[PDB]
């Protein structure tokens, strides 16, 4: 049960402020962070972050946006669903849009409604993915892929293992998100391999600390 090394994995998040790493040259998928919807003055606001839409040396990619509120007008949603369009028009193979839910406490009907709205406005060639901290009802979500995050910041959350046993009940393609160099017991991988819906792991790449 060592730390997480990128050279052992093949899918990655590239977040705002993180430098590309050679592991991205062996990957099948990359999840490209592109901004966040946040509350500025009791009102939703999209802040674009990360790389500009352009041609880059990457595998098939997702556009990832962190959503900290579900009170979002249709104009922001139009922005969000244009993002994968813009990355595709630059010449990249784009799989779709991944919403990273970091939005406190809503009822699952709320998340379902948000995802239904997004799916309505998202071009049908693009898939719709979900990711978020661990937290079965999930199967009702109108999504194509779910990624269960096991980390906070630079560290794996202690007792993440409490949430993994039940994932064998998922009925949609799912992955486990790990942070680079975090604590991780890879035996869990084999466990989750029992499910025909398990699609492996995604690694959150990190930069060095200025202190190191």
Automatic annotation (TrEMBL):
Alphabetic keyword roster: Signal
Classification via InterPro entries: DUF3142 (IPR021488)
One Pfam family named in its UniProt record: DUF3142
Domain of life of the native organism: Bacteria
Annotated protein name in UniProt: DUF3142 domain-containing protein
Originating species: Yersinia pseudotuberculosis serotype O:3 (strain YPIII)
């Amino acid at each position: 049960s060592h730390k997480v090394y990128a050279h052992d994995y093949q899918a990655f998040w590239l977040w705002s402020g993180v430098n590309p790493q050679p592991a991205l040259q062996q990957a099948n998928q990359v999840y490209l962070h592109q901004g966040e919807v946040v509350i500025r003055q009791r009102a939703a606001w999209f802040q674009k972050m990360g790389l500009p839409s352009s041609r880059l040396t990457l595998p098939a990619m997702w556009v990832t946006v962190r959503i900290t509120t579900l009170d979002v007008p249709d104009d922001i949603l139009a922005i969000l669903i244009d993002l994968p369009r813009r990355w595709a028009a630059a010449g990249n193979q784009v799989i779709g849009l991944q919403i990273d839910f970091d939005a406190g406490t809503y009822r699952l009907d709320d998340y379902a409604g948000f995802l239904r709205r997004v799916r309505t406005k998202l071009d049908p060639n693009f898939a719709l993915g979900v990711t978020g901290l661990l937290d079965q009802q999930l199967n009702a979500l109108p999504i194509d892929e779910l990624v269960i995050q096991t980390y906070q910041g630079r560290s794996t959350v202690n007792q993440y293992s409490r949430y993994l046993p039940a994932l064998l009940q998922l009925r949609l393609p799912f992955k486990i998100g790990l942070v680079q160099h975090g604590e991780w017991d890879p035996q869990w991988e084999q466990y989750l391999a029992a499910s025909p819906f398990y699609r492996g792991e995604v690694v959150f790449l990190l930069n060095h600390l200025r202190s190191e």
